Amino acid sequence: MENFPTEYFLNTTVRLLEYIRYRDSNYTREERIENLHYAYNKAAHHFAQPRQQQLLKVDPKRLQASLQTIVGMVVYSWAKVSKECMADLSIHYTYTLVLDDSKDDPYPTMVNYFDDLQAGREQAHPWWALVNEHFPNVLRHFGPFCSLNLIRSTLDFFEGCWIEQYNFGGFPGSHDYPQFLRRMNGLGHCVGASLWPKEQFNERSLFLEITSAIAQMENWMVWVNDLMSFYKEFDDERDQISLVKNYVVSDEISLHEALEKLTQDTLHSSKQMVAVFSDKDPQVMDTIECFMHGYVTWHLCDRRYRLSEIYEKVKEEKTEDAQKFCKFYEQAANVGAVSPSEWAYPPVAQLANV
């Protein structure tokens, strides 16, 4: 496995896109830009505040980059939620993304977690201090059940980052470890339940569909990301513990086999995703369908994933896949390719300095 399985990749991707029913939609480039800037502007103002500036140890250049990656992700996948919602979620998911920048052992700051929590004293760990303080702005858009899911998944996430600080791919033969870990820092339930604002949905009325959405969406969302970010992560010696890389270490199988395990779960996930929801409430299947499409557009458009390289390579090849891929790609670009100068400004730093 010296070269990238380009062939195999293009195929799986095209399949994924077909299974999910990837296709044109109602978001218009004008609307995308409207939201991108709204969400970005609110967040940027937030992170530019002195208190946030002070407690969130992050290289500005990176905070800037992360915020933009997150706004884009939210605005493109949470298509049916309100602008405020996109903004508030953008702030939350930007906090979670930023946490992977800390080597700082949580232990000492997590020693009085529960006692402080129960007492109502600000957490020792600055991340929690900021996140928990801001949480209400996200939580207000949801009902009690969904809120609990966001709260849990975020706590889960904090631990997942803790575990990852050990750059540990699992003991050989620890088959349960890889997914255990992936699920932990996957924020699956956060994503899954944040898709159902109480302004547009009734938690109690759609409890079974929402729950089922969360349950299924958790895996789809994470595996689609593991697959998409598999091209950028291929020749990157820095990223040592990914789901695929851990399957290799824990299950004791080849990278190809692991990559195989992933695609099968991903494709199967996609199939059942559509199967279960097609005939369900229209408004639900819509949010679901839009999340998947936007989530894939976002992966395809954001440079972070360097997929444009996969495109420029097979750009001409006359294979069904290669052509099926290139078509889909252009699809995304027509609505997903947007210069940051159109929405992401001014820079967070600039707002912070003022």
Angstrom distances, CA of residue 310 to CA of 23, 35, 36, 229, 255? 20, 29, 26, 12, 19
CB 16 within 8 A of CB 321: no
Of the candidates 50, 166, 236, 238, which one interacts with its own copies according to CB under 8 A?
166
As a three-state string, the secondary structure of the chain is CCCCCHHHHHHHHHHHHHHHCCCCCCCCHHHHHHHHHHHHHHHHHHHCCHHHHHHCCCCHHHHHHHHHHHHHHHHHHCCCCCHHHHHHHHHHHHHHHHHHHCCCCCHHHHCCHHHHHHHCCCCCCHHHHHHHHHHHHHHCCCCHHHHHHHHHHHHHHHHHHHHHCCCCCCCCCCCCHHHHHHHHCCCHHHHHHHCCCCCCCCCCCCHHHHHHHHHHHHHHHHHHHHHHCCCCCCCCCCCCCCHHHHHHHHHCCCHHHHHHHHHHHHHHHHHHHHHHHHCCCHHHHHHHHHHHHHHHHHHHHCHHHCHHHHHHHHCCCCCHHHHHHHHHHHHHHHHHCCCHHHCCCCCHHHHHHC
Q: Rule CB under 8 A: say whether 173 interacts with its own copies.
A: yes
- Minimum CB distance to its own copies smaller for 159 or for 257: 159
Match 């990656």 to its residue by tokens. Answer: 69
Query: Which residues ranging from 278 to 337 are in contact with its own copies (CB under 8 A)?
Result: 280
CB of 18 to Mg ion, least distance (A): 21
Give the footprint of Mg ion on this chain (CB under 5 A): 100, 185, 225, 229, 239
- Return d(Cα 335, Cα 43) in angstroms, integer: 23
- Minimum CB distance to Mg ion smaller for 113 or for 234: 234
Q: Which does 153 bind (CB under 5 to 8 A by kind): its own copies, Mg ion, none?
A: none
Q: Rule CB under 8 A: say whether 135 interacts with its own copies.
A: yes
Q: Rule CB under 8 A: say whether 272 interacts with its own copies.
A: yes
> According to the annotation, is 59 in a ligand binding site?
no
Q: Which does 155 bind (CB under 5 to 8 A by kind): Mg ion, its own copies, none?
A: its own copies
CB of 222 to Mg ion, least distance (A): 8
Q: Which stretch binds its own copies (CB under 8 A): 4-12, 52-60, 208-216, 328-336?
A: 208-216
CB of 273 to its own copies, least distance (A): 9
CB of 194 to its own copies, least distance (A): 14
> According to the annotation, is 100 in a ligand binding site?
yes
Q: Rule CB under 8 A: say whether 198 interacts with its own copies.
A: no
Q: Which stretch binds its own copies (CB under 8 A): 60-68, 92-100, 160-168, 343-351?
A: 160-168
> According to the annotation, is 229 in a ligand binding site?
yes
Q: Which stretch binds its own copies (CB under 8 A): 16-24, 63-71, 204-212, 288-296?
A: 204-212
Q: Rule CB under 8 A: say whether 186 interacts with its own copies.
A: no
- Binding-site residue ranges for Mg(2+): 100, 164, 225, 229, 233, 239, 241
Which residues here bind its own copies, judged by CB under 8 A?
A: 106-107, 110-111, 113-115, 117-121, 132-133, 135-136, 139, 143-145, 147-149, 151-152, 155-156, 158-159, 162-163, 166, 168, 170-177, 180-181, 203-204, 207-208, 211-212, 214-216, 218-219, 268-269, 272, 275-276, 280
